[PDB]
Amino acid sequence: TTIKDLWRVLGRPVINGGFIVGTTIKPKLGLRPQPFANACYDFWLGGDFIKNDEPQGNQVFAPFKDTVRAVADAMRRAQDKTGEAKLFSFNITADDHYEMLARGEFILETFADNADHIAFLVDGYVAGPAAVTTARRAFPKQYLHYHRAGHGAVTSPQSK
Amino acid sequence: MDQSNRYANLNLKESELIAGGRHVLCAYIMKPKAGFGNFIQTAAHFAAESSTGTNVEVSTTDDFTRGVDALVYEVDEANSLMKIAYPIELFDRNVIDGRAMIASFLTLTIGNNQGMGDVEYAKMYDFYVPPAYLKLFDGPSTTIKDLWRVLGRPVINGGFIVGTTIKPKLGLRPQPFANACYDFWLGGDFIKNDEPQGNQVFAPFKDTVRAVADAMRRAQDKTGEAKLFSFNITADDHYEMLARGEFILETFADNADHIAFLVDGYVAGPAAVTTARRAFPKQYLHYHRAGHGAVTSPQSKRGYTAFVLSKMARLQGASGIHTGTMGFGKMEGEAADRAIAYMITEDAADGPYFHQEWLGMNPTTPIISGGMNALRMPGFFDNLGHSNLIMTAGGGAFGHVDGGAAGAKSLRQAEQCWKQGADPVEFAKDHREFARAFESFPQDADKLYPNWRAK
Amino acid sequence: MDQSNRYANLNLKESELIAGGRHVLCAYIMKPKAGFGNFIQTAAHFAAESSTGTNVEVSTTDDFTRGVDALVYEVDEANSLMKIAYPIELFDRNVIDGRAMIASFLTLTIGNNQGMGDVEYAKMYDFYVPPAYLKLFDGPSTTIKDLWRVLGRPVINGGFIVGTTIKPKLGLRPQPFANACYDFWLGGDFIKNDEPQGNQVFAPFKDTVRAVADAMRRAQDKTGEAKLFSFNITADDHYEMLARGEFILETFADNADHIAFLVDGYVAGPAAVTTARRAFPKQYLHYHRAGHGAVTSPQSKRGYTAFVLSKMARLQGASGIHTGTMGFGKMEGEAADRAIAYMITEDAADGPYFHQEWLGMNPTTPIISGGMNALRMPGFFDNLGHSNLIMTAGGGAFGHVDGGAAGAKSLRQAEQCWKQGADPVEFAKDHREFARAFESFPQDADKLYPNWRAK
Ligand SMILES: O=C(O)[C@@](O)(COP(=O)(O)O)[C@H](O)[C@H](O)COP(=O)(O)O
Ligand SMILES: O=C(O)[C@@](O)(COP(=O)(O)O)[C@H](O)[C@H](O)COP(=O)(O)O
Ligand SMILES: [Mg+2]
Ligand SMILES: [Mg+2]
Ligand SMILES: [Mg+2]
């Protein structure tokens, strides 16, 4: 999957479809499910793309399924309001391969006719190539968002 | 009962329906049966039985239902033409991934309406899919580009892939089968299972696959060239399809990307094609269409055309599909079928009724097969205009007087001749295998190149 | 070119081929295209392209291949009849369980031969399967018997199942849909999804299943009788079919054995039917055949007949398949189609050309649908000879002047009328719901019972 598949969903030209306006939901952690979805709604009124901050997942104060449901609702309300398509990149990073599947499958089922508006984010450096490949091979039809948190430990020029 | 007031609106503009992007348009050649309704009444009933209605009024109908009625927006009784617009909301979607299914498109647009007692016949010649519906289809994940890469050819316009079908269609035991594979590969690139070849009692699946894997390695070592095979994994049982595919990929090991998977999509159905498409997206999906002639034939006035079948196949995710020899081979076909090739390869193309933008959806390769040989190829390429495709000649190769290997080279040389724009008879003078194709099929040479006995 | 020497042996006796039990026999109505070979030459080539050969001689052919050739063993040009014997060794088998697949049968017996350029048309009217091949097919695992048991009827000859299809075909949102279900169930037994109903954006699958499950519980409490529903689980993607099937069974819980699974077997293909058959063998498999008319119609001279389709469906494992209204409804059909019902229900039955022993393979129910109502039912039953079947009337029930519940009862009473051998008009005097069907469909009542308004 490429930006082209994101351009197509947005109704942009598939060749040089241009700039995708995005944000990361902040606070990095701490927003409970509905406050999270409200911020998503607010940004989508002016922007295209929203990613989970890299650690956001299934924290005790923001349960995964409740948060996904609220975000799906926010997407529908924002698209109804603006008349334009909106995208979200969900973090499905996990140690357990089957947890990654369970997260991805629930998201795609929840979003339903907006399923192709969904990207899957993987913390590829800390979880490893194995996590990246899990998402790549299980969900090839969903835009695979490689997040590289932790990479700086080696990639920094300070490192030799 | 007359349902034209509800299911017909000829004041609708086709250009506005397209621009709106909320409708699938279908163009039919339909004729009402005598002793029922007139053209519009029948067309209206047709639309109803294909969307929201039945043959009588029901109390359960509400205003929301009426909003999604399929509408007859254009008719031309003189040419028996009928055009229907389907609100895209009608078509079924997967619960698991929100994507489209061609089975739904088929059920509504060409299902029960094919059995209506008040219709004599009705055939779909074209359909239009808008972006919002188009982007929900799988589309091809693998293309000829990936075959070109394995062969070491340029990934852009990598050219002609010389192929064949193993003959006998059935009867070769595992090693005789593999020996035929080895022989052809000495001169050619591509080999497919004949469509019924699988796990016959006299040619067990695993033994045949093993022998062919060995044959591939021996041919690649001998020639120093990469070789391809398209294995039939068609089955009723989804898990049989997986088991066959998985064994093939494991057996071939480091040659696993040399493997294509063949599916008899028309008789086994869209479900079988999708099984292969979704389970093995990294393997070239070879859509074989055996049985299609029952409806696509011009002799038939029912079902859908070969154009329609090919266009559906692209949405389904076929890496390549058989498009026929366009009148140059043994099967029914027309030169005008070139338009079928263009519709499945280009990003923008014209159908008989609708222009289609594919929005960067991957192309489907035209696979040329059916009584082709070296002599018939130049004419075929002239009509199509390019050779960026797969062509197979079973009889044309193994029926070569000098054997399968020579047969393969005759196909290679035949395309080189067309590419060079040379005269076939003159070209043959400096190309033995191609020249020997004249003697292999003298009846063809006599008809195609009168007074060829120059040699 | 001329292959009659190899692929034709008219000295073969059909009785010995049958007694031999080593051949699948197929009967075609074929016409050669003008300007090619005669009948036997064309039939021979037909056999070649359907078994071991191609349109030319190949060097790879050995004596073993010659042994499994399909043979033309009978011809009658005057009647355009052609009979071919296929050695059962030709047909593909599963690696995983050694069982048969109908895809192979289709690919060989009615695949590529439907596109041959030298053939004008060819249609299969009958086929024979010998024991050695017959026993390798799944057959039905669930039958009407399992529905009768749920209803509390005798498991042998449990009688008529009063059914309907929910109309509008599409457009009812979840709760209006469930309301229509509840209403009909007050008078009827069985409800099926209209064939395209699934997971439309305005009627999400899981919400609809939930609403229908609630409707079933409410209707059963109210009536004190068991109620059945047949859900469409058709999809391109095998896993989409499973996801739908599993959710339904879990949702209905202690009513799970009240559930049938409907599959559009013709457009989705044999692969889809088999997915449901093998994944849910304990759930009634409802084979819906939308699209079939494109080949089975007598207007078509290609493909195969409805008889052939039905016979295959029994092998495939269909619990029931639509067999049509046999001329009494809105779809194309003839009274002689009664023979189709007999072939799929009995252990021994005659086809147009072949007698078939089924060796105790489970029966397939004749499912009657298409423009039926209370008024049309007696005539239909007279021609068939029994009412041990499922009949649905969508428009016939929800088009009833007093609503779905009254519609349901009118169908019940219509069958009660026929079984009692009473005169419909006289019977109506003491059965209001049935009498009100006359007023619901006055054009039907006028022809079927001319002076019904007098009384
Ligand atoms: O069985 C055959 O006849 C072929 O292997 C061709 O063999 P030859 O090369 O020996 O003729 C192909 O399956 C047909 O061409 C299919 O037809 P289409 O491509 O029209 O669907
Ligand atoms: O969509 C329909 O028309 C039906 O639900 C009948 O509705 P009605 O009762 O309102 O006519 C059935 O699918 C057809 O009968 C199929 O034909 P067949 O059984 O011949 O395959
Ligand atoms: Mg971050
Ligand atoms: Mg073939
Ligand atoms: Mg129906």
From Swiss-Prot, chains B, C:
InterPro entries found in the cross-reference section: RuBisCO, RuBisCo_large_chain_AS, RuBisCO_lsu_C, RuBisCO_lsu_C_sf, RuBisCO_lsu_fd_N, RuBisCO_lsu_N_sf, RuBisCO_lsuII
Residues forming the catalytic site: 167 (proton acceptor), 288 (proton acceptor)
GO molecular function: magnesium ion binding; monooxygenase activity; ribulose-bisphosphate carboxylase activity
Catalytic activity: 2 (2R)-3-phosphoglycerate + 2 H(+) = D-ribulose 1,5-bisphosphate + CO2 + H2O; D-ribulose 1,5-bisphosphate + O2 = 2-phosphoglycolate + (2R)-3-phosphoglycerate + 2 H(+)
Binding site for substrate: 112, 169, 289, 322, 369
Cofactor note (record): Binds 1 Mg(2+) ion per subunit.
Gene3D superfamilies associated with the record: Ribulose bisphosphate carboxylase, large subunit, C-terminal domain (3.20.20.110), RuBisCO large subunit, N-terminal domain (3.30.70.150)
Chain positions with N6-carboxylysine modification: 192
Pfam families found in the cross-reference section: RuBisCO_large, RuBisCO_large_N
GO BP terms: reductive pentose-phosphate cycle
Cofactor: Mg(2+)
Protein origin, superkingdom: Bacteria
Keyword Transcription regulation recorded: no
Keyword hit for Metal-binding: yes
Positions bound to Mg(2+): 192, 194-195
Residues carrying the site annotation Transition state stabilizer: 330
Entry's EC annotation: 4.1.1.39
UniProt cross-references to PROSITE patterns, sorted A to Z: RUBISCO_LARGE
Keywords from the UniProt entry: Calvin cycle, Carbon dioxide fixation, Lyase, Magnesium, Metal-binding, Monooxygenase, Oxidoreductase, Photosynthesis
Annotated NCBIfam families: PRK13475.1
Task of the protein: RuBisCO catalyzes two reactions: the carboxylation of D-ribulose 1,5-bisphosphate, the primary event in carbon dioxide fixation, as well as the oxidative fragmentation of the pentose substrate. Both reactions occur simultaneously and in competition at the same active site.
The protein's assembly and partners: Homodimer.
Similarity annotation: Belongs to the RuBisCO large chain family. Type II subfamily.
Other known facts: The basic functional RuBisCO is composed of a large chain homodimer in a 'head-to-tail' conformation. In contrast to form I RuBisCO, the form II RuBisCO are composed solely of large subunits.
Protein name: Ribulose bisphosphate carboxylase
Organism: Rhodopseudomonas palustris (strain ATCC BAA-98 / CGA009)
